[PDB]
Symmetry: D2
Subunit: 275 residues, 4 copies
């Protein structure tokens, strides 16, 4: 295993990634290409949450995949999140294709994962990047590679659906209303999505994920949806690993099965080797 | 364990039930009252599917509850399903209260489970029976007892949403359109619901379950929802037990976890003893 | 599902069984034959423990098999357990063969399950019934049918190994010392065994199960062995179902997985339909 | 996450380790000390198997622990494995104590894990390091820190029990017959052990792990033992991750649950945070 932290410069706003590369197993006689998961953590568009980075990356890596954590564009200085964050996702996927030979990456198995605010970036990208008119509009032309599926954990989906709490805050994320509601960008070309959230989510109302899932069904895109009946927002792994010290509310044994469900779903989609 | 099969006549249309009663464990120094689940199987309102009767009842009994299979009103012989089926559910719950001392039934833990067409009866009942005006409208007066929660497996929810396929068939089930869409009968008084379906369901579109769950959320009623990514309609246990001989399409190892999920959800609701 | 309770008289000491028969699923276009498990509960040879009867039978039935609870010979009324108990097992298997057509029993999939004291009867039977000389010695002549495998939960294996506590009690169970140590009756003809116990068992020392498994290995008989690290003797299902009211020591979530393990092992042996 | 590869020099034979350090989660308000697992892979004492290094480390790290892979002494040049490998384990634990403050390591939760040949090193260390006379004999005096438990996967336990196949090969490992049989070094001071193997193991007969478990029980040391009924030697994770390409025999879905069992066992032992 190797860790690589660097700046990628192939976007209008350069940005940092942290890649965790699997090394080839030495007593294997033939090389193996592995899937790769790009992770966009939460943080309300003002920070990148550590709880939704390495702990999640490490769990996915244990199942035999490379991971890359993307420091997508935040509200910082006078800058909004969009359109920049969408171009950075495209640039990261393109960079992966250039690294694929060196690190044994299966470019037909690039998965995107977004949590809370990072889920808006990923859910929006799923719609934008799979539609030529929108790729051009948001300057995604001339990037190589494409993702094969997305995973969304308690995602922000529609900026008018409860998160954020004010119009001023919404506008800071983007004044481009075409990007407020990711469910409205779904077409039959959108990639398959595994979506999970808790029904008791207060800060990002579960109507968010429900609306995205509804739009996916209505456009005949393969999707799985797990709305657990309890738990606060921001559970992450929902176990002791991502538990804020002394806070029981970050533990939910029902929701904690989601990585297993997600990995099995990836296997069903033929995007991860089965066993 | 005891099996009791009989006709109940305390409804305009008499009907058959099959009760599977738990016996007390003789080692125990004190008697214990157990929850009870009423099961309404599928069958498109033209029969009662055996795949969704004893196999499901037995799995639930293994977790320490009594079960009752309800042969609800069908359209055979040019009959309507409603309002008769609601009265029969009411009468089954009532009969259960009269059997509580004899069988150690905990009447604060009566659970309703509906599959496909049976899910329409249960979901509709969840709204109707919890609203005094509707109880009077549909003649549930003088029926004792109430259920505490429902479980719905690939349920028919809205008779205009894909099942059945024609206006004639919809109206045959009932010409009373206030009863067509169970999601519209949801109020804060509805009991909590565990709901599951497959996203690829081609007989009753998944929008059915999604709409019901949306309404539950919008009325602040506790709910959990598992929309598995793959699998045909009518999986039942989704394993070898309910598999039609030689038909692999009735097997889905991901969906097969639903009973464990439902049982753990019941425990969380305080409706089944915990571990 | 049907419950049948009756006395079998085809042994020197008549005895009671309780059979729980699966009914055919009417939806199925073809009939199917199911495996059947004979359960011998614990009770220290002075009673038959209900905690190890219906609760265990029901869990096994949920996986698609018939079950029979066997009230094997006890020492009450100054009786010995052997050789009578062996004949009663033989006679139960024989009776099962006569019921095969009536109940769709697959007689190539008869499984024996023994708990604690019941485990001694089953383990001993596994050696005795598979050896022509011992079948003649203990009068199993003219009994039809044979079992295909055994399951043992915290079994008494060797009457000199901690249970019972005195020579008098050991000899009361049987003055025939060739029957004291079931591990010594193991030959390559013994049927495959799934064995589990807790390492902290203080009533029947875990050396009991360990010795049996060692002998199975040494005679090239397929075996699996799960010695859980914690938990008292007599956990049964190790969950709320078999928990003595208010006694937390009967709960062990790690040991509670044993039925799933045993069922998956049966599938691997080709003795239960797979998924 | 940080990777550190270096030589440790505090032993007669210096040696390499590879440490995978968890970083502190940035949005946590208070620091958290994490357990650490030292892994000794297999390789028949002639190499260090890659299949039993990073893939296993990564799985344990996903559960919230640091890991260190130990390149213990191999048969190389004219050198035997012992006594050197035992001193290198002591030196690694001592080095961990010196790093504990910097990396937030809980020194009361140092776990040792050994696979096949590496299991002999760990099982022998468990006995040697917990007995003052033997610590002195094997030059382990004046090292700081101690392990709290061990995990053994299909371990070589007794060098006379089938692995290796010749006396010449055994002697190359060590001519010190006091160290041939790790079960004979067990005392009540040995640390708790989680042990797993397959019953069908051909290259390291399962009598190995059975003998170690038997000795632990007989000296009242807490132990758990899982002898799965099928699978070849060297399964590692027993899933697609450690599967040699195109070889189904490295897949065993039953044995693949061992990491989950091991982690839960560590939690029961109070050696890993619960959830």
């Amino acid at each position: 295993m190797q860790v690589e932290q660097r700046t990628l410069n192939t976007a209008a706003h350069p940005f940092q990634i942290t890649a965790y590369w699997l090394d080839q197993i030495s007593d294997f006689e033939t090389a193996v290409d592995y899937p790769i998961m790009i992770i966009c953590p939460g943080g309300g568009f003002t920070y990148h949450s550590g709880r939704e980075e390495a702990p999640i990356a490490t769990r996915m890596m244990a199942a035999g995949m490379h991971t890359v954590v993307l420091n997508y564009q935040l509200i910082v200085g006078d800058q909004s999140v969009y359109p920049w964050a969408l171009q950075q996702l495209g640039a990261t996927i393109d960079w992966i294709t250039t690294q694929a030979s060196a690190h044994h990456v299966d470019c037909q198995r690039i998965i995107l994962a977004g949590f809370s605010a990072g889920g808006h970036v990923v859910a929006t990208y799923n719609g934008v990047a799979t539609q030529p008119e929108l790729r051009t509009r948001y300057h995604l032309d001339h990037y190589q590679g494409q993702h094969a599926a997305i995973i969304l954990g308690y995602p922000v989906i529609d900026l008018t659906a409860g998160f954020p709490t004010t119009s001023a805050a919404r506008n800071q994320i983007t004044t481009d209303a075409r990007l407020w509601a990711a469910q409205r960008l779904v077409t039959p070309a959108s990639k398959p999505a595994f979506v999970w959230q808790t029904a008791t989510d207060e800060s990002v109302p579960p109507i968010n994920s429900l609306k995205y899932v509804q739009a996916m069904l209505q456009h005949q895109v393969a999707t799985a949806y797990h709305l657990f009946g309890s738990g606060i927002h921001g559970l992450a792994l929902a176990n002791h690993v991502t538990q804020k010290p002394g806070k029981d509310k970050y533990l939910n044994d029902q929701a904690a099965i989601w990585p297993q469900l997600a990995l099995r779903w990836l296997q069903e989609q033929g995007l991860l080797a089965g066993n």
